[PDB]
Amino acid sequence: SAHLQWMVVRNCSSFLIKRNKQTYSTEPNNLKARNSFRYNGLIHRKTVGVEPAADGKGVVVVMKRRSGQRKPATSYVRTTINKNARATLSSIRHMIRKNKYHPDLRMAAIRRASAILRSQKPVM
Amino acid sequence: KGKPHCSRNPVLVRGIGRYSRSAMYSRKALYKRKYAALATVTKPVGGGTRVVKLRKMPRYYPTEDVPRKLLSHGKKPFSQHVRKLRASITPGTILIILTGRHRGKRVVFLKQLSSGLLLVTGPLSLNRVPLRRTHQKFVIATSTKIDISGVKIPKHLTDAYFKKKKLRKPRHQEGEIFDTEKEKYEITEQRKVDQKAVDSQILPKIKAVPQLQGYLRSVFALTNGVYPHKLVF
Amino acid sequence: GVDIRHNKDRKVRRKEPKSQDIYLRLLVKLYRFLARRTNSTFNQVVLKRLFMSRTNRPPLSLS
Amino acid sequence: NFAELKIKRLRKKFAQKMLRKARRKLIYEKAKHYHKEYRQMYRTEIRMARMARKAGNFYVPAEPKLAFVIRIRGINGVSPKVRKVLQLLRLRQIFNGTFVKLNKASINMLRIVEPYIAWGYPNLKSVNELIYKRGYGKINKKRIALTDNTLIARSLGKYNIICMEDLIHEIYTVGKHFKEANNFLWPFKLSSPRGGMKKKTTHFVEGGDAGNREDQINRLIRRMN
Amino acid sequence: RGLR
Amino acid sequence: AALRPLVKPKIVKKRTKKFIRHQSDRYVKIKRNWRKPRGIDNRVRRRFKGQILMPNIGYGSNKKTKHMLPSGFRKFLVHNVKELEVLLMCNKSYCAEIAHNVSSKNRKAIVERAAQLAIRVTNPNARL
Amino acid sequence: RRVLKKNPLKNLRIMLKLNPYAKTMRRNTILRQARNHKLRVERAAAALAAKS
RNA sequence: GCCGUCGCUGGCAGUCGGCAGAGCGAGAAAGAGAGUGGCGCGGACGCUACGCCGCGACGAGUAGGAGGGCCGCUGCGGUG
RNA sequence: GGGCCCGGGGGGCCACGCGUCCCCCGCGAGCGCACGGGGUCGGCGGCGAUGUCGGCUACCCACCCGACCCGUCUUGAAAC
Ligand SMILES: [Mg+2]
Ligand SMILES: [Mg+2]
Ligand SMILES: [Mg+2]
Ligand SMILES: [Mg+2]
Ligand SMILES: [Mg+2]
Ligand SMILES: [Mg+2]
Ligand SMILES: [Mg+2]
Ligand SMILES: [Mg+2]
Ligand SMILES: [Mg+2]
């Protein structure tokens, strides 16, 4: 279960990183990258990830479907959003709210899909 | 649609009224005053009509935001603060400057501006101190006053009129090419006409007091054996 | 200075179980929640006994 | 709907706004009667002496019920019999102060601890300054500053002490629930005597500081609180 | 009710 | 073009000097690192007047500004490019410090990434 | 969070937060005092005409 | 004001959101209970619960005891 | 003096409803101001690119106060 494998992963993971009085985590679908039950991207039954698109522009969103739970291959669905900075930040918002899909992660997902746009604009 | 009325009880002391609660009720005659019981906008387009939304969602969200702060009640902006003034300073009083370029120069106090700075002007022809602002703390109020009540000080001599104006001459391409240093403060013909007009009314009164003009032309300075706490000025 | 004695300032009760198993450290989470969020002095006793060592909670016999 | 639950919640928010006006009126008309009480107990102590000076006799005023005790020595070198009594008086620290009702068993303790305290009979203005400025309550075994009457009512309410005025009246006029009010009052922490002690190590009758200075405790309170 |  | 922090509070430190060891001046075998003096007749551990001082717990730093560099940022050792994405959601409160061993060919493609990510690096001109 | 302790003896509205009677206790002894000082200046200005 | 210890065997899983209604500080043992008859799709942070937060009181120490060290040294199984 | 200063015939009241029975003879809205659950200014001025700004720590130097050499046995050690 989620709380079980969190009580197993809280200290003896391989993504856990502990130096400089901080403790972050390098999980695939952990947004804010910090080691916590709430933001861990491997423990729960429904997670959310916001990665940068493989090319220059866009933001991919990785939801974890419910049906396939022990099948890692057909477990995650991915959607590339190569739109303006605002439509994508209303599409992630709809993807999360209107679906009622792990709704306490929404502002984290927006802040991350904004960090990506900002790290994909032309530098100065 | 009731006409506003001032407080019906004078303030004996700050925070305490002159009349009691029942007295206020009787004065207000409340015994006969019993009472009992946007974002979207349609706009045509070249098609159909579009429901344009005002103040759309921001296009950027910084990774972190500062949390809000608690609410205070007793803190107000400087513009709304109450400007104090020691009773030792009155219109026509002679003051001595201590910090400005007019160090130790005697001037004739004009009035107090809205901000709080004292608008003062010593005779320009005597001490060369025109209409200017000076803080009350940094000025010594000499115990020598002259009737200046009959002096129509122009109304446009506000704090904004006396506010500084950035030269805004760091550099430019035009200025780098045809450099003209960093400019100066060219005394406006308005500040000059105002200074002349004020002097035309102040000087006749000053000359009435014998030796007053010479005293103003003089400069206050400490000497051997003189201590500020031991002499009354 | 005050003339108190700190001999007994540190109460020695068990703040948590000494074991590290995670099927007990989850029961203790659920019962610490019930203990603080309910007004039943039952949950508080169950929690205080879930802390106790293996020698303070002995076995029961069926008889 | 929710139009019913709204007006219901507003009736609750109006009953909780009237149960407070009734309590502010009660506190007000209480303090208004304590002003009258104190005025009577003051004027009658002058009557009962003028009626004795008219006949020529003497009026012996009632021995006082309330004392205020202050600790004027350190914790370094105290006997055990004096260290047990300075801690049943809750004076575990120099310049601590407390109120004490007088009887045989109390005077016979202020005699054991006489060289370590400087006690006396507090004025009403002195109990006012003390309760208001240095007034802390022993709530839940926590020294919580008395900031509102709902901190006194919440604990001493069952004794009909519901405001700082009922507290002052219960302390000044030593009441039935004196033990409970004095034990609800965290012992006052006073600063050093401004001006300075006369002599800490000798009795007040010896031109010093210790002992009982019946009337003159207020002169020390004003320069210490 | 008194104030109605 | 400095990368400002989220908020820059006032940093106050109850002590700036190090805590030198007793008699680290008369000798060379006694280093400056601190060792609590445990001798009987010692004058430092009795807290005499005018002697060396001792690291009490009272000298602790304000928790609000503890470990916080004078640039209003906390810090993080970065061993490679991949360890930046861990820090990209802590941008305005933590900084990066490429390790001492990362060669300049990698440190260039690390400062480059942290530049895109707007993450502040304390040693961005390190090796070159 | 901890409530800062103001002084009920220097803070008028904390004195009214703790003792709503002190408002009238203080409006008195201010009216009464301005009227006793007006009675004194009346005596003392009838005596400058009683020794004149 | 700041650091820490102790105590409150304190509080927080309620982040209960167009399947919504945003509360449990207030002197007085207990329900913002049910039924039964007279446009604009929007709302910061949090929660490694071994975590976070709030309150007070306290802070010497040899011999000795205990705890906590993201203090340090060398090798082993894993893992970066 | 006390009894709501028992009862009859110029200033202050946290008193001011109508309808009785009777002994004593449950929601009025607004609008502001503030000694009101810990500081804000919607106030300002000066200088700033080869000589100036900041750097508490870290190098040297100056001065004032403090300041005996550590481990040890000892009732006691800076100890002749
Ligand atoms: Mg102490
Ligand atoms: Mg002694
Ligand atoms: Mg003095
Ligand atoms: Mg200690
Ligand atoms: Mg010396
Ligand atoms: Mg030895
Ligand atoms: Mg010997
Ligand atoms: Mg020795
Ligand atoms: Mg010798």
Coordinates of N, CA and C in Angstrom, one line a residue, chain F residues 23-111:
Chain F
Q23 N 45.5 27.2 25.0 CA 47.0 27.2 24.8 C 47.3 26.7 23.4
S24 N 46.5 27.1 22.4 CA 46.9 26.9 21.0 C 47.9 27.9 20.5
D25 N 48.4 28.8 21.4 CA 49.3 29.8 21.0 C 50.7 29.6 21.5
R26 N 50.9 29.0 22.7 CA 52.2 28.7 23.2 C 52.9 27.5 22.5
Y27 N 52.0 26.7 21.8 CA 52.5 25.5 21.2 C 52.1 25.4 19.7
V28 N 52.8 24.6 19.0 CA 52.5 24.3 17.6 C 51.7 22.9 17.5
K29 N 51.9 22.0 18.5 CA 51.2 20.7 18.4 C 49.7 20.9 18.7
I30 N 49.3 22.0 19.3 CA 47.9 22.2 19.7 C 47.3 23.1 18.6
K31 N 46.5 22.4 17.8 CA 45.8 23.1 16.7 C 44.7 24.0 17.2
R32 N 44.1 24.8 16.3 CA 43.0 25.8 16.7 C 41.7 25.1 16.9
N33 N 41.5 23.9 16.4 CA 40.2 23.2 16.6 C 39.9 23.1 18.1
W34 N 38.7 23.1 18.4 CA 38.3 23.2 19.8 C 38.3 21.8 20.5
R35 N 38.7 21.8 21.7 CA 38.7 20.6 22.6 C 38.3 21.1 24.0
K36 N 37.2 20.6 24.5 CA 36.7 21.0 25.8 C 37.8 20.7 26.9
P37 N 38.3 21.7 27.6 CA 39.4 21.4 28.5 C 38.8 20.7 29.8
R38 N 39.4 19.6 30.1 CA 38.9 18.8 31.2 C 39.8 18.7 32.4
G39 N 40.9 19.5 32.4 CA 41.8 19.4 33.5 C 41.3 20.0 34.8
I40 N 41.9 19.5 35.9 CA 41.3 19.9 37.3 C 41.5 21.4 37.5
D41 N 42.8 21.8 37.5 CA 43.1 23.2 37.8 C 42.9 24.2 36.7
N42 N 42.2 23.8 35.6 CA 42.2 24.6 34.4 C 41.4 25.9 34.7
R43 N 41.9 27.0 34.2 CA 41.3 28.3 34.4 C 40.3 28.7 33.3
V44 N 40.2 27.9 32.2 CA 39.3 28.2 31.1 C 37.9 27.6 31.4
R45 N 37.9 26.4 31.9 CA 36.7 25.7 32.1 C 36.0 26.1 33.4
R46 N 36.7 26.8 34.3 CA 36.0 27.5 35.4 C 35.4 28.8 35.0
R47 N 35.6 29.2 33.7 CA 35.0 30.5 33.3 C 35.5 31.7 34.1
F48 N 36.8 31.7 34.3 CA 37.4 32.9 34.9 C 37.2 34.1 34.1
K49 N 37.7 35.3 34.6 CA 37.5 36.5 33.8 C 38.7 36.8 32.9
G50 N 38.4 37.2 31.7 CA 39.4 37.6 30.8 C 40.1 36.4 30.1
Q51 N 39.6 35.2 30.3 CA 40.2 34.0 29.7 C 39.6 33.7 28.4
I52 N 40.0 32.6 27.7 CA 39.4 32.1 26.6 C 37.9 31.7 26.9
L53 N 37.1 31.8 25.9 CA 35.7 31.5 26.0 C 35.4 30.0 25.6
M54 N 34.1 29.6 25.8 CA 33.8 28.2 25.6 C 32.5 28.2 24.7
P55 N 32.4 27.2 23.7 CA 31.3 27.2 22.9 C 30.0 26.7 23.6
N56 N 29.3 27.6 24.3 CA 28.0 27.2 24.8 C 27.0 27.0 23.7
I57 N 25.8 26.5 24.1 CA 24.7 26.4 23.2 C 24.0 27.7 23.0
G58 N 24.3 28.7 23.9 CA 23.7 30.0 23.8 C 24.1 30.8 22.5
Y59 N 25.2 30.5 22.0 CA 25.7 31.2 20.8 C 25.0 30.7 19.5
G60 N 24.0 29.8 19.6 CA 23.4 29.3 18.4 C 22.9 30.4 17.5
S61 N 22.7 30.1 16.2 CA 22.3 31.1 15.2 C 20.8 31.1 15.1
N62 N 20.2 32.2 14.8 CA 18.7 32.2 14.5 C 18.4 31.2 13.5
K63 N 17.4 30.4 13.8 CA 17.0 29.3 12.9 C 16.4 29.8 11.6
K64 N 15.9 31.0 11.6 CA 15.3 31.6 10.4 C 16.5 31.9 9.4
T65 N 17.7 32.2 9.9 CA 18.8 32.6 9.0 C 20.0 31.7 9.3
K66 N 19.8 30.4 9.6 CA 20.9 29.5 9.9 C 21.3 28.8 8.6
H67 N 22.6 28.7 8.4 CA 23.3 28.1 7.2 C 23.1 29.0 6.0
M68 N 22.6 30.3 6.2 CA 22.3 31.1 5.1 C 23.5 32.0 4.7
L69 N 24.0 31.9 3.5 CA 25.1 32.7 3.1 C 24.8 34.2 3.1
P70 N 25.8 35.0 3.1 CA 25.5 36.5 3.0 C 24.8 36.9 1.8
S71 N 24.5 36.0 0.8 CA 23.7 36.3 -0.4 C 22.2 36.0 -0.2
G72 N 21.8 35.7 1.1 CA 20.4 35.4 1.3 C 20.0 34.0 0.8
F73 N 21.0 33.2 0.4 CA 20.7 31.8 -0.2 C 21.4 30.8 0.8
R74 N 20.7 29.7 0.9 CA 21.4 28.5 1.4 C 22.1 27.8 0.2
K75 N 22.7 26.7 0.5 CA 23.7 26.2 -0.5 C 23.5 24.7 -0.8
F76 N 24.1 24.2 -1.8 CA 24.0 22.8 -2.1 C 25.2 22.4 -3.0
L77 N 25.9 21.3 -2.6 CA 26.9 20.7 -3.5 C 26.3 20.0 -4.7
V78 N 26.8 20.4 -5.9 CA 26.3 19.8 -7.1 C 27.4 19.0 -7.8
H79 N 27.2 17.7 -8.0 CA 28.2 16.8 -8.5 C 28.1 16.7 -10.1
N80 N 27.0 17.0 -10.7 CA 26.8 16.9 -12.1 C 25.5 17.6 -12.5
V81 N 25.2 17.6 -13.8 CA 24.1 18.4 -14.3 C 22.8 17.9 -13.7
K82 N 22.7 16.5 -13.6 CA 21.4 16.0 -13.2 C 20.9 16.4 -11.8
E83 N 21.9 16.9 -11.0 CA 21.5 17.3 -9.6 C 21.0 18.8 -9.6
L84 N 20.8 19.4 -10.7 CA 20.2 20.7 -10.8 C 18.7 20.6 -10.8
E85 N 18.1 19.7 -11.6 CA 16.7 19.6 -11.6 C 16.1 19.3 -10.2
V86 N 16.9 18.7 -9.3 CA 16.5 18.6 -7.9 C 16.4 19.9 -7.3
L87 N 17.1 20.9 -7.8 CA 17.2 22.3 -7.2 C 16.4 23.3 -8.0
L88 N 15.7 22.9 -9.0 CA 15.1 23.9 -9.9 C 13.8 24.4 -9.3
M89 N 13.2 23.7 -8.4 CA 12.0 24.2 -7.7 C 12.3 24.8 -6.3
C90 N 13.6 24.9 -6.0 CA 14.1 25.7 -4.8 C 14.9 26.9 -5.3
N91 N 14.6 27.4 -6.4 CA 15.5 28.4 -7.1 C 15.8 29.6 -6.2
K92 N 14.8 30.2 -5.7 CA 15.0 31.5 -5.1 C 15.3 31.4 -3.6
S93 N 15.8 30.3 -3.1 CA 16.2 30.1 -1.7 C 17.5 29.3 -1.5
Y94 N 17.9 28.5 -2.5 CA 19.1 27.7 -2.4 C 19.9 28.0 -3.6
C95 N 21.2 27.8 -3.5 CA 22.2 28.0 -4.6 C 23.0 26.7 -4.8
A96 N 23.8 26.7 -5.9 CA 24.5 25.5 -6.3 C 26.0 25.9 -6.2
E97 N 26.8 24.8 -5.8 CA 28.2 24.9 -5.7 C 28.8 23.7 -6.3
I98 N 29.3 23.8 -7.6 CA 29.8 22.7 -8.3 C 31.0 22.1 -7.5
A99 N 31.1 20.8 -7.4 CA 32.1 20.2 -6.5 C 33.5 20.6 -6.9
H100 N 34.4 20.2 -6.1 CA 35.8 20.6 -6.4 C 36.4 19.7 -7.5
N101 N 35.9 18.5 -7.7 CA 36.5 17.5 -8.6 C 35.9 17.6 -10.0
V102 N 34.7 18.1 -10.2 CA 34.1 18.2 -11.5 C 35.0 19.0 -12.5
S103 N 35.5 18.4 -13.5 CA 36.5 19.0 -14.4 C 35.8 20.2 -15.1
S104 N 36.7 21.0 -15.8 CA 36.1 22.2 -16.4 C 35.2 21.9 -17.6
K105 N 35.4 20.7 -18.2 CA 34.6 20.4 -19.4 C 33.1 20.1 -18.9
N106 N 33.0 19.6 -17.7 CA 31.6 19.3 -17.2 C 31.1 20.5 -16.5
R107 N 32.0 21.2 -15.7 CA 31.6 22.4 -15.0 C 31.1 23.5 -16.0
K108 N 31.5 23.5 -17.2 CA 31.0 24.4 -18.2 C 29.6 24.1 -18.6
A109 N 29.3 22.8 -18.8 CA 28.0 22.4 -19.2 C 27.1 22.2 -17.9
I110 N 27.6 22.6 -16.8 CA 26.8 22.7 -15.6 C 26.4 24.1 -15.3
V111 N 27.4 25.0 -15.3 CA 27.1 26.4 -15.2 C 26.1 26.8 -16.4

